[PDB]
Design a protein around this ligand. Structure first.
Ligand SMILES: [Mg+2]
Ligand SMILES: [Mg+2]
Ligand SMILES: [Mg+2]
Ligand SMILES: [Mg+2]
Ligand SMILES: [Mg+2]
Ligand SMILES: [Mg+2]
Ligand SMILES: [Mg+2]
Ligand SMILES: [Mg+2]
Ligand SMILES: [Mg+2]
Ligand SMILES: [Mg+2]
Ligand SMILES: [Mg+2]
Ligand SMILES: [Mg+2]
Ligand SMILES: [Mg+2]
Ligand SMILES: [Mg+2]
Ligand SMILES: [Mg+2]
Ligand SMILES: [Mg+2]
Ligand SMILES: [Mg+2]
Ligand SMILES: [Mg+2]
Ligand SMILES: [Mg+2]
Ligand SMILES: [Mg+2]
Ligand SMILES: [Mg+2]
Ligand SMILES: [Mg+2]
Ligand SMILES: [Mg+2]
Ligand SMILES: [Mg+2]
Ligand SMILES: [Mg+2]
Ligand SMILES: [Mg+2]
Ligand SMILES: [Mg+2]
Ligand SMILES: [Mg+2]
Ligand SMILES: [Mg+2]
Ligand SMILES: [Mg+2]
Ligand SMILES: [Mg+2]
Ligand SMILES: [Mg+2]
Ligand SMILES: [Mg+2]
Ligand SMILES: [Mg+2]
Ligand SMILES: [Mg+2]
Ligand SMILES: [Mg+2]
Ligand SMILES: [Mg+2]
Ligand SMILES: [Mg+2]
Ligand SMILES: [Mg+2]
Ligand SMILES: [Mg+2]
Ligand SMILES: [Mg+2]
Ligand SMILES: [Mg+2]
Ligand SMILES: [Mg+2]
Ligand SMILES: [Mg+2]
Ligand SMILES: [Mg+2]
Ligand SMILES: [Mg+2]
Ligand SMILES: [Mg+2]
Ligand SMILES: [Mg+2]
Ligand SMILES: [Mg+2]
Ligand SMILES: [Mg+2]
Ligand SMILES: [Mg+2]
Ligand SMILES: [Mg+2]
Ligand SMILES: [Mg+2]
Ligand SMILES: [Mg+2]
Ligand SMILES: [Mg+2]
Ligand SMILES: [Mg+2]
Ligand SMILES: [Mg+2]
Ligand SMILES: [Mg+2]
Ligand SMILES: [Mg+2]
Ligand SMILES: [Mg+2]
Ligand SMILES: [Mg+2]
Ligand SMILES: [Mg+2]
Ligand SMILES: [Mg+2]
Ligand SMILES: [Mg+2]
Ligand SMILES: [Mg+2]
Ligand SMILES: [Mg+2]
Ligand SMILES: [Mg+2]
Ligand SMILES: [Mg+2]
Ligand SMILES: [Mg+2]
Ligand SMILES: [Mg+2]
Ligand SMILES: [Mg+2]
Ligand SMILES: [Mg+2]
Ligand SMILES: [Mg+2]
Ligand SMILES: [Mg+2]
Ligand SMILES: [Mg+2]
Ligand SMILES: [Mg+2]
Ligand SMILES: [Mg+2]
Ligand SMILES: [Mg+2]
Ligand SMILES: [Mg+2]
Ligand SMILES: [Mg+2]
Ligand SMILES: [Mg+2]
Ligand SMILES: [Mg+2]
Ligand SMILES: [Mg+2]
Ligand SMILES: [Mg+2]
Ligand SMILES: [Mg+2]
Ligand SMILES: [Mg+2]
Ligand SMILES: [Mg+2]
Ligand SMILES: [Mg+2]
Ligand SMILES: [Mg+2]
Ligand SMILES: [Mg+2]
Ligand SMILES: [Mg+2]
Ligand SMILES: [Mg+2]
Ligand SMILES: [Mg+2]
Ligand SMILES: [Mg+2]
Ligand SMILES: [Mg+2]
Ligand SMILES: [Mg+2]
Ligand SMILES: [Mg+2]
Ligand SMILES: [Mg+2]
Ligand SMILES: [Mg+2]
Ligand SMILES: [Mg+2]
Ligand SMILES: [Mg+2]
Ligand SMILES: [Mg+2]
Ligand SMILES: [Mg+2]
Ligand SMILES: [Mg+2]
Ligand SMILES: [Mg+2]
Ligand SMILES: [Mg+2]
Ligand SMILES: [Mg+2]
Ligand SMILES: [Mg+2]
Ligand SMILES: [Mg+2]
Ligand SMILES: [Mg+2]
Ligand SMILES: [Mg+2]
Ligand SMILES: [Mg+2]
Ligand SMILES: [Mg+2]
Ligand SMILES: [Mg+2]
Ligand SMILES: [Mg+2]
Ligand SMILES: [Mg+2]
Ligand SMILES: [Mg+2]
Ligand SMILES: [Mg+2]
Ligand SMILES: [Mg+2]
Ligand SMILES: [Mg+2]
Ligand SMILES: [Mg+2]
Ligand SMILES: [Mg+2]
Ligand SMILES: [Mg+2]
Ligand SMILES: [Mg+2]
Ligand SMILES: [Mg+2]
Ligand SMILES: [Mg+2]
Ligand SMILES: [Mg+2]
Ligand SMILES: [Mg+2]
Ligand SMILES: [Mg+2]
Ligand SMILES: [Mg+2]
Ligand SMILES: [Mg+2]
Ligand SMILES: [Mg+2]
Ligand SMILES: [Mg+2]
Ligand SMILES: [Mg+2]
Ligand SMILES: [Mg+2]
Ligand SMILES: [Mg+2]
Ligand SMILES: [Mg+2]
Ligand SMILES: [Mg+2]
Ligand SMILES: [Mg+2]
Ligand SMILES: [Mg+2]
Ligand SMILES: [Mg+2]
Ligand SMILES: [Mg+2]
Ligand SMILES: [Mg+2]
Ligand SMILES: [Mg+2]
Ligand SMILES: [Mg+2]
Ligand SMILES: [Mg+2]
Ligand SMILES: [Mg+2]
Ligand SMILES: [Mg+2]
Ligand SMILES: [Mg+2]
Ligand SMILES: [Mg+2]
Ligand SMILES: [Mg+2]
Ligand SMILES: [Mg+2]
Ligand SMILES: [Mg+2]
Ligand SMILES: [Mg+2]
Ligand SMILES: [Mg+2]
Ligand SMILES: [Mg+2]
Ligand SMILES: [Mg+2]
Ligand SMILES: [Mg+2]
Ligand SMILES: [Mg+2]
Ligand SMILES: [Mg+2]
Ligand SMILES: [Mg+2]
Ligand SMILES: [Mg+2]
Ligand SMILES: [Mg+2]
Ligand SMILES: [Mg+2]
Ligand SMILES: [Mg+2]
Ligand SMILES: [Mg+2]
Ligand SMILES: [Mg+2]
Ligand SMILES: [Mg+2]
Ligand SMILES: [Mg+2]
Ligand SMILES: [Mg+2]
Ligand SMILES: [Mg+2]
Ligand SMILES: [Mg+2]
Ligand SMILES: [Mg+2]
Ligand SMILES: [Mg+2]
Ligand SMILES: [Mg+2]
Ligand SMILES: [Mg+2]
Ligand SMILES: [Mg+2]
Ligand SMILES: [Mg+2]
Ligand SMILES: [Mg+2]
Ligand SMILES: [Mg+2]
Ligand SMILES: [Mg+2]
Ligand SMILES: [Mg+2]
Ligand SMILES: [Mg+2]
Ligand SMILES: [Mg+2]
Ligand SMILES: [Mg+2]
Ligand SMILES: [Mg+2]
Ligand SMILES: [Mg+2]
Ligand SMILES: [Mg+2]
Ligand SMILES: [Mg+2]
Ligand SMILES: [Mg+2]
Ligand SMILES: [Mg+2]
Ligand SMILES: [Mg+2]
Ligand SMILES: [Mg+2]
Ligand SMILES: [Mg+2]
Ligand SMILES: [Mg+2]
Ligand SMILES: [Mg+2]
Ligand SMILES: [Mg+2]
Ligand SMILES: [Mg+2]
Ligand SMILES: [Mg+2]
Ligand SMILES: [Mg+2]
Ligand SMILES: [Mg+2]
Ligand SMILES: [Mg+2]
Ligand SMILES: [Mg+2]
Ligand SMILES: [Mg+2]
Ligand SMILES: [Mg+2]
Ligand SMILES: [Mg+2]
Ligand SMILES: [Mg+2]
Ligand SMILES: [Mg+2]
Ligand SMILES: [Mg+2]
Ligand SMILES: [Mg+2]
Ligand SMILES: [Mg+2]
Ligand SMILES: [Mg+2]
Ligand SMILES: [Mg+2]
Ligand SMILES: [Mg+2]
Ligand SMILES: [Mg+2]
Ligand SMILES: [Mg+2]
Ligand SMILES: [Mg+2]
Ligand SMILES: [Mg+2]
Ligand SMILES: [Mg+2]
Ligand SMILES: [Mg+2]
Ligand SMILES: [Mg+2]
Ligand SMILES: [Mg+2]
Ligand SMILES: [Mg+2]
Ligand SMILES: [Mg+2]
Ligand SMILES: [Mg+2]
Ligand SMILES: [Mg+2]
Ligand SMILES: [Mg+2]
Ligand SMILES: [Mg+2]
Ligand SMILES: [Mg+2]
Ligand SMILES: [Mg+2]
Ligand SMILES: [Mg+2]
Ligand SMILES: [Mg+2]
Lengths: 189, 110, 84, 141
RNA sequence: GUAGAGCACUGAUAGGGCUAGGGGGCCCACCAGCCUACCAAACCCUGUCAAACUCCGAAGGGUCCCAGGUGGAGCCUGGGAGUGAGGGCGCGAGCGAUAACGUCCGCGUCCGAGCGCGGGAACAACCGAGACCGCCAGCUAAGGCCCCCAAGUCUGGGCUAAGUGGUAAAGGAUGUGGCGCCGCGAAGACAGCCAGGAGGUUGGCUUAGAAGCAGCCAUCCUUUAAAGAGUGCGUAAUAGCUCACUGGUCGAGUGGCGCCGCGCCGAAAAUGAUCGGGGCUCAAGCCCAGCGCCGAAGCUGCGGGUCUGGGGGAUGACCC
RNA sequence: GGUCGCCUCCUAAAAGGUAACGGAGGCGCCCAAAGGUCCCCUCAGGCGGGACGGAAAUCCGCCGGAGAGCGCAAGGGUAG
RNA sequence: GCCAUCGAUCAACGGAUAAAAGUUACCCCGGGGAUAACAGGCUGAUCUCCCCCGAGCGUCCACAGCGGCGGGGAGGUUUGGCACCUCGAUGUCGGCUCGUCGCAUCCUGGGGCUGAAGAAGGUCCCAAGGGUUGGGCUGUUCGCCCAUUAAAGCGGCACG
RNA sequence: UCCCCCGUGCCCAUAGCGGCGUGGAACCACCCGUUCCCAUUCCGAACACGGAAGUGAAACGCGCCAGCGCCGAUGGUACUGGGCGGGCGACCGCCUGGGAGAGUAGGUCGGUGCGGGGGA
């Protein structure tokens, strides 16, 4: 739940060049600092797949620095569906907003009834200090029948963690399945 | 959001400001009345007369007349003679009127 | 042979172009009377030495130099600074 | 059959199809999606056709998402008539799709099940397509 | 106020939440409790769409001032016109069918009038280039350098095996080279070899037995180095008989997924064929790098003509 | 067959202008107040409360920048 | 005359007269390939042919024979679109005569699968060498019908 | 020449909504009264006049806090003036200059001019 990844500085070098040279341009900022950076693409990839916005990534800077960062945002090539830039948000002692992976557990009554659990939110935005960033946030989705749902206003919350959205943000629900016989009255429509 | 107070103010003030003359503005508190003369080009008061500053008293209307008269004295001295009357949110009547009437025979051209 | 039951067109017209717009710009020298802006409504407002005609036309009242101004919520204004 | 309930205007100019997709480029609902590789006017017939194909494939089960909608009126002048004398009539609606646009999504159906179903769907579409899995990249968007 | 983008307005919009009302059942009705895998206004979240939507908004474009700019520039007055069928190409739109050597506009260009010159086989408008005249001199452009046909059968480095090159799509494939990621592995794997691979199936059943193998009927339990109420063959049927499977043996690599380069199929026409032809396969094809050279009426050299300007003339004639 | 003049919007490619038997709509009137001026006032809509009285008549309260109104089509403008 | 003002669906709205509809195959002249009908050409919507998908049918079994909803092409026979050659003339259907070429093959030849027992048939592949009848009806092309046949192919050639 | 208040402009929400607190010496406001001037399609609500018993409750001024609203980089990308290349073709790609919108970090409970009154 704490990852490393080597980073490097950059100035004039054109992003285009850097990309077709297998690196990935980025940036590194918080209220106090802001620095153009780049990482190895293939190296970022393997890390980011696991870490995501959810877990802290530590940037090994050339000047021997080791910075705690969250990935704040990631810019995609629309055509290619492939990363073209990264934002690294350097953590400070301060509390920070962030997305924490929800973990639904227990197979819902509705899923058994033949429905399907639509996982509306997969992470939830939260105020929390770095030293105490949680991860798996369990959710009993088991009592959920078809036509029911639960909201943010129904979450575990480890201590020292703020429901940083509307409480009424609907978290997940259970929806009736696709069904071939529905096509009948869809034809009768 | 706006009070009818404010709406009147803008409405009568803007019209006068367009004529480009000097502006005789007026404030009419429950206890006093004040009148300053303004160059809206530069945004500056050229001369001012008031009840509080005059250390004056003796029935509001009769008082008001004098502050006008006094206003003209200091005005004409400076060179001011041509002027336009900002009657503010107040109906041209009574106290405000008296200020005008005084400032008139006091020498101001308006 | 060819020319079969075709159709018609229930519309297909327009009005004449009205040549609206700003006619003199910031920094342009102008004679009193010069048309400064042709417009519909006050897309611009008359400022210093600028009058407005019945169809919202903005013209100079003095010989001078045209000057523009955006006063935010109070609208945009065309002025004419006279020249000494 | 998709089409607007109501319409501000009945006929609509054709337009070009410049650039990559404007947005709707990341998976947002299910686990797998179908992505447009080349641009096209996707007919309301095709949308529906793909939809049915998936439905049918995993008979009763899973949920299908449809991230495209035909709001563009498609015109056609009658057969064997000449140019001019007005614009043709509306004869259907299309959805303008561009490369990168995820068009369908599925969920709550096994990985193998999703793969075949989305695959069949693409066969109905007039363009080249690719299937994709929900990524860390998608959830980041 | 466009391209882009955006949803704040006007509309559109999929899912979810929330929630007036509407519908089905219940209570049963008189009013009220209804609860609702149905329909759904407003509203909220996710996710989008629009020439006649815009909270936003470039690049550009326009005009003004200052500066450069002496040009077959510019401005004023007047004499003489011709033109008022245009077209192709690039780009931006409408119409059309995201047809047309289509049509209608806009910006540019060329043909028109440059059907004069080089290239593109041939070819107004594509690439190169604006032809005053002469030369058996030179340099270059595009395009080329194996022969027709001027110049490298030049030099490195890859790919292609289809004559692809030498003109087509969805989509199909153990083509081929190159990158990856994923399990397997000598804690002897993959390929075959291989002793083994009894059912108390007394299948719940079956009827001229329809006792594992028409009969998609819990779809048993055993001895374990491993043997399924069965992956199969003679059957409506007993025999027979493969597979699963562990077991050694073998000894060193094997399996699956993804991306890139180049190629294969899909690929049927009417007088005789063909990449212009011959012909071409570590190329005479494709891609990367380098050094040469060929070549147009362009540019240069030499001679001459004429127009304009500026000098000369310390004058016309003439001269530079 | 349709059209023929005028106006509004788009097409129109961010100055002006710009075509098609391209996409949508209007006009051939009107007002002695719907004109001039001085003075005063501020909408629509929502929620709550209120005899007859309702979705909506008139009254009270709180909210509200303009989504109302501006004779007429549309645009622009507009409660300073 | 001057000044003010009135009479215009002069609406074909820059308004030809104060005052005006048809017809010609009985027709004529000047022009136009600036412009239609024939044919060519570009296009290929329509037309014909061939594919991709595999929903489902075929007792059983997606693929013997079939192929929902949809998707991609080839051809240039049909009807069109466009108006590029031709209006100082490119004669237009069917028949006859003479053919010749294409092959997406009607027959004959060689094959694969078959829900191929055999005989037959179905479907696909190869193959253009040769062959592909005579009548009734209608101007007919097309089409129906009679009698046969190994078969009574379809297209191009200015619908030769 | 620092502080508070009053009138008035300018910048036009970083200034606003909302919340909590503070202020009556002075100013200002509500306040007191309807004789007079003036006034209400009814009402001294408003406008107006004569006042000063009361109060900062309202309003207003000044603070404080970031729920709302508003502002919002850097980095990257879209698009693009100009110049090019690949592909039969649909469309892609390169150099050069310019460069958004969204979103991220983050900012904000205003800043200033002229006059008047009152302070230390
Ligand atoms: Mg390390
Ligand atoms: Mg800071
Ligand atoms: Mg690497
Ligand atoms: Mg550390
Ligand atoms: Mg369960
Ligand atoms: Mg629901
Ligand atoms: Mg239906
Ligand atoms: Mg329906
Ligand atoms: Mg407001
Ligand atoms: Mg008012
Ligand atoms: Mg007002
Ligand atoms: Mg000022
Ligand atoms: Mg006294
Ligand atoms: Mg007197
Ligand atoms: Mg005087
Ligand atoms: Mg015809
Ligand atoms: Mg007709
Ligand atoms: Mg009609
Ligand atoms: Mg117009
Ligand atoms: Mg005009
Ligand atoms: Mg026009
Ligand atoms: Mg005026
Ligand atoms: Mg005007
Ligand atoms: Mg300025
Ligand atoms: Mg300003
Ligand atoms: Mg404003
Ligand atoms: Mg204003
Ligand atoms: Mg305004
Ligand atoms: Mg609908
Ligand atoms: Mg396009
Ligand atoms: Mg784009
Ligand atoms: Mg693009
Ligand atoms: Mg691009
Ligand atoms: Mg898009
Ligand atoms: Mg799930
Ligand atoms: Mg499933
Ligand atoms: Mg497809
Ligand atoms: Mg994926
Ligand atoms: Mg993944
Ligand atoms: Mg998220
Ligand atoms: Mg705008
Ligand atoms: Mg505009
Ligand atoms: Mg708005
Ligand atoms: Mg609007
Ligand atoms: Mg709306
Ligand atoms: Mg809506
Ligand atoms: Mg919805
Ligand atoms: Mg809903
Ligand atoms: Mg009901
Ligand atoms: Mg009932
Ligand atoms: Mg009842
Ligand atoms: Mg009862
Ligand atoms: Mg009831
Ligand atoms: Mg009753
Ligand atoms: Mg009853
Ligand atoms: Mg209930
Ligand atoms: Mg527009
Ligand atoms: Mg637009
Ligand atoms: Mg902005
Ligand atoms: Mg803004
Ligand atoms: Mg702007
Ligand atoms: Mg800018
Ligand atoms: Mg600009
Ligand atoms: Mg100059
Ligand atoms: Mg002439
Ligand atoms: Mg002329
Ligand atoms: Mg003419
Ligand atoms: Mg012409
Ligand atoms: Mg031209
Ligand atoms: Mg041209
Ligand atoms: Mg061409
Ligand atoms: Mg072209
Ligand atoms: Mg298009
Ligand atoms: Mg198309
Ligand atoms: Mg096209
Ligand atoms: Mg074409
Ligand atoms: Mg087409
Ligand atoms: Mg074209
Ligand atoms: Mg075109
Ligand atoms: Mg041009
Ligand atoms: Mg030439
Ligand atoms: Mg030329
Ligand atoms: Mg010629
Ligand atoms: Mg040439
Ligand atoms: Mg040539
Ligand atoms: Mg050629
Ligand atoms: Mg020629
Ligand atoms: Mg040509
Ligand atoms: Mg030639
Ligand atoms: Mg030529
Ligand atoms: Mg060339
Ligand atoms: Mg070139
Ligand atoms: Mg040279
Ligand atoms: Mg040379
Ligand atoms: Mg060149
Ligand atoms: Mg060269
Ligand atoms: Mg050669
Ligand atoms: Mg030669
Ligand atoms: Mg040679
Ligand atoms: Mg071959
Ligand atoms: Mg070849
Ligand atoms: Mg070649
Ligand atoms: Mg080619
Ligand atoms: Mg070819
Ligand atoms: Mg080729
Ligand atoms: Mg291909
Ligand atoms: Mg393959
Ligand atoms: Mg494969
Ligand atoms: Mg493979
Ligand atoms: Mg390959
Ligand atoms: Mg690895
Ligand atoms: Mg691993
Ligand atoms: Mg494996
Ligand atoms: Mg591994
Ligand atoms: Mg071991
Ligand atoms: Mg068996
Ligand atoms: Mg059976
Ligand atoms: Mg059991
Ligand atoms: Mg036996
Ligand atoms: Mg046996
Ligand atoms: Mg993979
Ligand atoms: Mg790769
Ligand atoms: Mg890859
Ligand atoms: Mg091929
Ligand atoms: Mg050759
Ligand atoms: Mg050659
Ligand atoms: Mg050859
Ligand atoms: Mg020459
Ligand atoms: Mg020469
Ligand atoms: Mg000579
Ligand atoms: Mg010479
Ligand atoms: Mg000289
Ligand atoms: Mg001389
Ligand atoms: Mg008529
Ligand atoms: Mg323009
Ligand atoms: Mg009336
Ligand atoms: Mg009044
Ligand atoms: Mg009033
Ligand atoms: Mg109301
Ligand atoms: Mg009410
Ligand atoms: Mg009521
Ligand atoms: Mg009643
Ligand atoms: Mg009321
Ligand atoms: Mg509105
Ligand atoms: Mg109303
Ligand atoms: Mg307004
Ligand atoms: Mg309005
Ligand atoms: Mg305002
Ligand atoms: Mg006279
Ligand atoms: Mg008429
Ligand atoms: Mg009439
Ligand atoms: Mg006429
Ligand atoms: Mg006449
Ligand atoms: Mg005449
Ligand atoms: Mg006769
Ligand atoms: Mg005759
Ligand atoms: Mg003829
Ligand atoms: Mg011909
Ligand atoms: Mg066509
Ligand atoms: Mg048809
Ligand atoms: Mg085919
Ligand atoms: Mg069946
Ligand atoms: Mg079978
Ligand atoms: Mg099946
Ligand atoms: Mg098949
Ligand atoms: Mg059907
Ligand atoms: Mg088709
Ligand atoms: Mg053809
Ligand atoms: Mg033909
Ligand atoms: Mg044709
Ligand atoms: Mg033409
Ligand atoms: Mg032509
Ligand atoms: Mg004849
Ligand atoms: Mg005969
Ligand atoms: Mg014949
Ligand atoms: Mg045959
Ligand atoms: Mg045969
Ligand atoms: Mg056979
Ligand atoms: Mg048989
Ligand atoms: Mg078949
Ligand atoms: Mg033959
Ligand atoms: Mg033959
Ligand atoms: Mg034959
Ligand atoms: Mg016969
Ligand atoms: Mg006959
Ligand atoms: Mg006959
Ligand atoms: Mg017939
Ligand atoms: Mg016959
Ligand atoms: Mg027979
Ligand atoms: Mg016969
Ligand atoms: Mg023939
Ligand atoms: Mg023909
Ligand atoms: Mg014929
Ligand atoms: Mg023909
Ligand atoms: Mg024939
Ligand atoms: Mg101080
Ligand atoms: Mg201030
Ligand atoms: Mg400021
Ligand atoms: Mg504000
Ligand atoms: Mg609050
Ligand atoms: Mg608070
Ligand atoms: Mg408190
Ligand atoms: Mg406090
Ligand atoms: Mg306190
Ligand atoms: Mg006191
Ligand atoms: Mg008294
Ligand atoms: Mg009395
Ligand atoms: Mg009285
Ligand atoms: Mg009065
Ligand atoms: Mg009275
Ligand atoms: Mg009354
Ligand atoms: Mg009255
Ligand atoms: Mg307060
Ligand atoms: Mg707070
Ligand atoms: Mg905030
Ligand atoms: Mg703003
Ligand atoms: Mg930036
Ligand atoms: Mg940049
Ligand atoms: Mg560019
Ligand atoms: Mg460009
Ligand atoms: Mg190009
Ligand atoms: Mg090319
Ligand atoms: Mg490309
Ligand atoms: Mg380049
Ligand atoms: Mg370049
Ligand atoms: Mg740049
Ligand atoms: Mg650039
Ligand atoms: Mg703060
Ligand atoms: Mg604030
Ligand atoms: Mg505040
Ligand atoms: Mg402060
Ligand atoms: Mg200062």
């Amino acid at each position: 739940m704490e990852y490393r990844l080597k980073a490097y500085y950059r100035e004039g070098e054109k992003p285009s060049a850097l990309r077709r040279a297998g690196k990935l341009p980025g940036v590194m900022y918080n209220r106090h600092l802001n620095r153009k950076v780049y990482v190895d693409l293939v190296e970022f990839d393997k890390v980011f797949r696991q870490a995501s916005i959810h877990h802290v990534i530590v940037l090994e800077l050339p000047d021997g620095q080791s910075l705690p960062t969250l990935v704040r945002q990631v810019n995609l090539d629309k055509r290619r569906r492939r990363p073209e830039h990264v934002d690294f948000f350097v953590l400070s002692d301060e509390p920070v907003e962030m997305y924490v992976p929800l973990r639904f557990v227990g197979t819902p009554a509705g899923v058994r009834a033949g429905g399907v659990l639509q996982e509306i939110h997969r992470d939830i935005l939260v105020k929390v200090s770095p030293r105490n960033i949680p991860e798996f946030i369990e959710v009993d989705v088991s009592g959920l029948e078809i036509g029911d749902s639960l909201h943010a206003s129904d979450l575990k919350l480890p201590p020292g963690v703020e429901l940083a959205v509307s409480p009424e943000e609907t978290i997940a629900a259970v929806v009736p399945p696709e069904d071939v016989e529905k096509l009948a009255e869809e034809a009768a429509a | 959001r706006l009070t009818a107070y404010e709406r009147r103010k803008f409405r009568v003030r803007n019209r006068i400001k367009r004529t480009g003359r000097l502006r005789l503005s007026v404030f009419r508190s429950l206890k006093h009345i004040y009148a300053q003369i303004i160059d809206d080009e530069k945004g500056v008061t050229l001369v001012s007369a008031s009840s509080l500053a005059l250390k004056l008293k003796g029935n509001k209307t009769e008082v008001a007349r004098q502050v006008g008269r006094a206003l003209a004295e200091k005005a004409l001295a400076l060179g001011i003679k041509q002027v336009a009357f900002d009657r503010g949110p107040y109906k041209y009547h009574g106290r405000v009127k008296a200020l005008a009437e005084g400032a008139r025979e006091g020498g101001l051209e308006f | 042979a060819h020319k079969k039951g075709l159709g018609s067109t229930r519309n297909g017209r327009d009005s004449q172009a009205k040549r609206l717009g700003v006619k003199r710009y910031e920094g342009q020298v102008v004679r009193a009377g010069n048309i400064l802006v042709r417009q519909r409504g006050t897309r611009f407002k008359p400022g210093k030495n600028v009058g407005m005609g019945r169809d919202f036309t903005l013209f100079a009242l003095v010989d001078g130099v045209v000057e523009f101004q955006d006063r935010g919520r109070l609208g945009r204004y065309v002025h004419v600074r006279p020249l000494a | 059959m998709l089409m607007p309930r109501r319409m501000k205007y009945r006929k609509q100019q054709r337009g070009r199809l410049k650039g990559a997709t404007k947005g709707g480029d990341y998976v947002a609902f299910g686990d797998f999606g179908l992505v447009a590789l080349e641009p096209a006017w996707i007919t309301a017939q095709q949308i529906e056709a793909a939809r049915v194909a998936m439905v049918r494939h995993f008979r009763r089960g899973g949920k299908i998402f449809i991230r495209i909608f035909p709001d563009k009126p498609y015109t056609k002048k009658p057969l064997e008539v000449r140019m001019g004398k007005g614009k043709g009539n509306v004869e259907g609606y299309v959805a303008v799709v561009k490369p990168g646009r995820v068009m369908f999504e599925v969920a709550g159906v096994t990985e193998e099940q999703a793969m075949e179903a989305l695959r069949i769907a693409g066969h109905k579409l007039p363009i080249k397509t690719k299937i994709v899995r929900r990524d860390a990249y998608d959830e980041a968007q």
